Every structure is written in structure tokens, then in C-alpha cells.
Design a protein around this motif. Structure first.
Motif, mmCIF file in Angstrom:
data_model
loop_
_atom_site.group_PDB
_atom_site.id
_atom_site.type_symbol
_atom_site.label_atom_id
_atom_site.label_comp_id
_atom_site.label_asym_id
_atom_site.label_seq_id
_atom_site.Cartn_x
_atom_site.Cartn_y
_atom_site.Cartn_z
ATOM 1 N N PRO A 99 0.812 -1.204 0.000
ATOM 2 C CA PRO A 99 0.000 0.000 0.000
ATOM 3 C C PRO A 99 0.845 1.253 0.000
ATOM 4 N N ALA A 100 0.312 2.333 -0.553
ATOM 5 C CA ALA A 100 1.052 3.578 -0.702
ATOM 6 C C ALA A 100 1.527 4.103 0.630
ATOM 7 N N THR A 101 0.751 3.944 1.679
ATOM 8 C CA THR A 101 1.177 4.423 3.007
ATOM 9 C C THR A 101 2.478 3.751 3.433
ATOM 10 N N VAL A 102 2.538 2.430 3.254
ATOM 11 C CA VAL A 102 3.702 1.628 3.683
ATOM 12 C C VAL A 102 4.894 2.032 2.856
ATOM 13 N N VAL A 103 4.709 2.120 1.563
ATOM 14 C CA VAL A 103 5.799 2.404 0.637
ATOM 15 C C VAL A 103 6.342 3.802 0.892
ATOM 16 N N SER A 104 5.446 4.783 1.134
ATOM 17 C CA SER A 104 5.908 6.153 1.445
ATOM 18 C C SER A 104 6.741 6.136 2.726
ATOM 19 N N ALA A 105 6.297 5.417 3.731
ATOM 20 C CA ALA A 105 7.040 5.326 4.998
ATOM 21 C C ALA A 105 8.414 4.734 4.773
ATOM 22 N N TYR A 106 8.559 3.762 3.890
ATOM 23 C CA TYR A 106 9.878 3.190 3.588
ATOM 24 C C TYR A 106 10.757 4.224 2.921
ATOM 25 N N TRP A 107 10.323 4.800 1.812
ATOM 26 C CA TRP A 107 11.191 5.655 1.019
ATOM 27 C C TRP A 107 11.478 6.985 1.707
ATOM 28 N N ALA A 108 10.650 7.385 2.638
ATOM 29 C CA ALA A 108 10.920 8.606 3.441
ATOM 30 C C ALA A 108 12.206 8.440 4.230
ATOM 31 N N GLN A 109 12.679 7.227 4.429
ATOM 32 C CA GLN A 109 13.934 6.983 5.189
ATOM 33 C C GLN A 109 15.110 6.976 4.266
ATOM 34 N N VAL A 110 14.996 7.312 2.995
ATOM 35 C CA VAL A 110 16.110 7.313 2.036
ATOM 36 C C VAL A 110 16.233 8.728 1.487
ATOM 37 N N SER A 111 17.351 9.402 1.794
ATOM 38 C CA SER A 111 17.650 10.787 1.355
ATOM 39 C C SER A 111 17.541 10.859 -0.166
ATOM 40 N N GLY A 112 16.701 11.741 -0.676
ATOM 41 C CA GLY A 112 16.597 11.973 -2.096
ATOM 42 C C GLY A 112 15.687 11.005 -2.822
ATOM 43 N N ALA A 113 15.069 10.035 -2.152
ATOM 44 C CA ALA A 113 14.122 9.140 -2.842
ATOM 45 C C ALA A 113 12.858 9.888 -3.185
ATOM 46 N N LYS A 114 12.234 9.529 -4.289
ATOM 47 C CA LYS A 114 11.010 10.172 -4.716
ATOM 48 C C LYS A 114 10.293 9.234 -5.632
ATOM 49 N N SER A 115 8.991 9.462 -5.756
ATOM 50 C CA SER A 115 8.176 8.784 -6.763
ATOM 51 C C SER A 115 8.243 9.549 -8.067
ATOM 52 N N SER A 116 8.654 8.924 -9.130
ATOM 53 C CA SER A 116 8.806 9.523 -10.464
ATOM 54 C C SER A 116 7.713 8.945 -11.376
ATOM 55 N N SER A 117 6.775 9.786 -11.808
ATOM 56 C CA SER A 117 5.744 9.405 -12.804
ATOM 57 C C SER A 117 6.430 9.101 -14.147
ATOM 58 N N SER A 118 7.515 9.804 -14.481
ATOM 59 C CA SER A 118 8.265 9.546 -15.748
ATOM 60 C C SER A 118 8.871 8.134 -15.743
ATOM 61 N N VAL A 119 9.442 7.706 -14.621
ATOM 62 C CA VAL A 119 10.111 6.386 -14.576
ATOM 63 C C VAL A 119 9.094 5.283 -14.276
ATOM 64 N N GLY A 120 8.046 5.592 -13.535
ATOM 65 C CA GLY A 120 6.996 4.656 -13.137
ATOM 66 C C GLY A 120 7.203 4.045 -11.766
ATOM 67 N N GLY A 121 7.744 4.797 -10.821
ATOM 68 C CA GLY A 121 7.752 4.375 -9.421
ATOM 69 C C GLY A 121 8.804 5.117 -8.666
ATOM 70 N N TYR A 122 9.060 4.658 -7.476
ATOM 71 C CA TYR A 122 10.092 5.234 -6.607
ATOM 72 C C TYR A 122 11.476 4.921 -7.144
ATOM 73 N N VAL A 123 12.250 5.986 -7.147
ATOM 74 C CA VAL A 123 13.697 5.978 -7.468
ATOM 75 C C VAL A 123 14.441 6.619 -6.349
ATOM 76 N N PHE A 124 15.723 6.329 -6.289
ATOM 77 C CA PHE A 124 16.556 6.820 -5.186
ATOM 78 C C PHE A 124 17.949 7.042 -5.716
ATOM 79 N N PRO A 125 18.750 7.880 -5.021
ATOM 80 C CA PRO A 125 20.123 8.085 -5.481
ATOM 81 C C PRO A 125 20.916 6.819 -5.352
ATOM 82 N N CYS A 126 21.666 6.488 -6.421
ATOM 83 C CA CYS A 126 22.474 5.294 -6.399
ATOM 84 C C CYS A 126 23.542 5.361 -5.291
ATOM 85 N N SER A 127 23.849 6.532 -4.783
ATOM 86 C CA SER A 127 24.810 6.656 -3.665
ATOM 87 C C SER A 127 24.217 6.248 -2.343
#
Ligand SMILES: COC(=O)COc1cccc(CN)c1
Ligand code: NA
Length: 330
Positions: free
Chosen positions: A228-256
Motif C-alpha cells: 500500500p502507498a502508506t507503507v511504501v511512502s514510509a519506507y522511502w521517506a527513510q532514504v535521502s533523495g528518494a522520490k516517486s517519479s511518474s516519468s520512470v513509473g515508481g520510486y527511485v533513489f540516489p544510487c549513492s
């Protein structure tokens, strides 16, 4: 009887796993994607439109002394990713890891969608969900597991997927050497044709565990973990620079980034997915944006415990009269 087969990642990301399957007499060995989220055993074949075959090994029923056309039967299936295939049906002898089924429906593709053509490593699918989802018409067919069940020592199969490594599918027995601790079993609904169960909650990294019911399916044929979106948002909120990208089709994060683990509940037990399992690498070759392995289910209609989750566990698919699902750490 029992069977035991090694399953191997098709690529360096564990996008899917292939398992060798013997079809026909003499045997024709095809590498199939074992899929607990569907119920058709279909193969690239001598009937597949030539322009839609690019490197796959094909099944040729005319070279099998045990192949029989299942007269009048057709099949057509569409998957959660928009891919599809269709064709006609043979019965033949099918063996997995030394376990043989005679008279198995082998669905021969006449047409496959582009995603199948483009994956030279996958010669077809072997469905392991409930036979109620099988698409053969006008006579629905049984899965390999449902046909094998009565012969098996125990009416079970197990999935032990590797992280960037081979793993094992076993039929008819539970390898007590393959996991640590105990197996926790949980109830299954067959109402939708899936190994559908309810997780008891989740934690992100070293965070507190959130008790909450999450109903989803155990699906070896889905790469990622869709929640669910709530769970997934809570996960990615713990990763600096992670975001949901409509262009890519989901959450992306800095490779660093270093990713946190993700824990899911099975009853009172906990399965921990290491952070590394959630990194699916650059979105395009050379990019510094990386694709996440935990994604929202909100556009699906179902939560999916795909390979990202399952490969953190030893998973028992118990096909007894009342099916259940077991998870152990490993
Ligand atoms: C193996 O390919 C994928 O994982 C594609 O993404 C999906 C996403 C959701 C459901 C499905 C159906 N298995 C696929
Ligand atoms: Na992708």
C-alpha cells in the motif's frame, strides 16, 4: 514421490528466475519461469509466430512420442505487467527435478507479446497458483502441482529463491536444512485463485514494528514487492533523495544511498528483507538514479509479495485440503 530443481536468476538484478523442465519423449528441456501467481504451463514452441521468437528454446510436439493434441482446446492469458500469450494445447509428460507428471497440459504459444520475445532467457511459464485460474477453454486444465499432488510424499512445494544466486524449488517435501529457526504458517484464501494471505505488519530499518493487516499474494513470478502507498511512502521517506517519479513509473533513489531493511510480519514472526535486496540499480545504463524494489500497489488492485520479499525467506506452499503458507528465515 518428490522433485528438486535449481532455479537461477536470469540476470544480475534477479529480475526473474528460470528452472529447467523436461517436456516430452525424448526430453526437451526448456527453462521456465515458475510463477505462483498464475496457473498456466505455456511454452515457446514450433507453433510460435517466427518473428516473435528471438533466442528461446522451443518445444516441438511433433518430435515427442508422448505428445497428444488436446483437440479444440485454446488458451489466452494476460499478466499484471501488460504481457500476454495465447495458443493451443498438447498433453505430454513433464518432469521437474525428477518428479514426473504424465498427461500434463502443455500450452503451446502461437503468439507472445513483445516482453516475452525480448527475454531470450525465458522459454515459458510454469504456473503454480490454483487451477481455478487456468485459462484453457473449453476444458480448464490442472497445474503441474495439482497433477503431481496425489503422488507426492506431502502435498507441498517450497520456494527458496537466492539473492544474486541460484536457489531451489522442491516438490513433496520440506528440506529442514534449508532454513533457520521455525516455519510460521499462515492462512490462505483461494477465493481469487492465488496464494493470498495477510501479513501482520511491517517495520522500516531499525524502526518500530507497525501492527497492521496487509492482504497480499505470494507471487514468485513478480520481481518486486508491491504494498500500500502508506507503507511504501514510509519506507522511502527513510532514504535521502528518494522520490516517486511518474516519468520512470515508481520510486527511485540516489544510487549513492544505503537502503534500510524492510521487515514484514508473518503471524508473530518477522522476515527481514536486507536493504541490498531493494536496490534494482540504475534506471538506465549509467544513470545515478536507481530503481526501488518496494513500489506502491495502488494502481494494481492487489498487494504482491514478489521475489524481493520471497527471496528473504524459505517459503512453503502447502496444498493440503486447507492450504496454508509457511515462512522461515534462512
Ligand atoms: C517479472 O516481471 C515483472 O515482475 C513485471 O512486473 C509485474 C508487476 C506486477 C505484476 C506482474 C505479474 N507477474 C508483473
Ligand atoms: Na523496470
Amino acid at each position: 514421490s518428490t522433485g528438486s530443481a535449481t532455479t537461477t536468476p536470469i540476470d544480475s538484478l534477479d529480475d526473474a528466475y528460470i528452472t529447467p523442465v523436461q517436456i516430452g519423449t525424448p526430453a526437451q528441456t526448456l527453462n521456465l519461469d515458475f510463477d505462483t501467481g498464475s496457473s498456466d504451463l505455456w511454452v515457446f514452441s514450433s507453433e510460435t509466430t517466427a518473428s516473435e521468437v528471438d533466442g528461446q528454446t522451443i518445444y516441438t510436439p511433433s518430435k515427442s512420442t508422448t505428445a497428444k493434441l488436446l483437440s479444440g482446446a485454446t488458451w489466452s492469458i494476460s499478466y499484471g505487467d501488460g504481457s500476454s500469450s495465447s495458443g493451443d494445447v498438447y498433453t505430454d509428460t513433464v518432469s521437474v527435478g525428477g518428479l514426473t507428471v504424465t498427461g500434463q497440459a502443455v500450452e503451446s504459444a502461437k503468439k507472445v507479446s513483445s516482453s516475452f520475445t525480448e527475454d531470450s532467457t525465458i522459454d515459458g511459464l510454469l504456473g503454480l497458483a490454483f487451477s481455478t485460474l487456468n485459462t484453457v477453454s473449453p476444458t480448464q486444465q490442472k497445474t503441474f502441482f495439482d497433477n503431481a499432488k496425489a503422488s507426492l510424499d506431502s502435498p507441498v512445494f517450497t520456494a527458496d529463491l537466492g539473492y544474486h544466486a541460484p536457489g531451489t524449488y522442491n516438490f513433496g517435501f520440506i528440506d529442514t536444512t534449508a532454513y533457520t529457526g521455525s516455519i510460521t504458517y499462515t492462512a490462505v484464501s483461494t477465493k481469487q485463485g492465488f496464494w493470498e494471505w495477510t501479513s501482520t505488519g511491517y517495520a522500516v530499518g531499525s524502526g518500530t514494528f507497525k501492527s497492521t493487516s496487509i492482504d497480499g499474494i505470494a507471487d514468485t513470478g513478480t520481481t518486486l514487492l508491491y504494498l500500500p502507498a502508506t507503507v511504501v511512502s514510509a519506507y522511502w521517506a527513510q532514504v535521502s533523495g528518494a522520490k516517486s517519479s511518474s516519468s520512470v513509473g515508481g520510486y527511485v533513489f540516489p544510487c549513492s544511498a544505503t537502503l534500510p531493511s524492510f521487515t514484514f510480519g508473518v503471524g508473530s514472526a518477522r522476515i527481514v528483507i536486507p536493504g541490498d535486496y531493494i536496490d534494482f540499480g540504475p534506471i538506465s545504463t549509467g544513470s545515478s538514479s536507481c530503481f526501488g524494489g518496494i513500489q506502491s500497489s495502488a494502481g494494481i488492485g492487489i498487494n504482491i509479495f514478489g521475489d524481493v520479499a520471497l527471496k528473504a525467506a524459505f517459503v512453503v506452499f502447502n496444498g493440503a485440503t486447507t492450504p496454508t503458507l509457511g515462512f522461515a528465515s534462512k
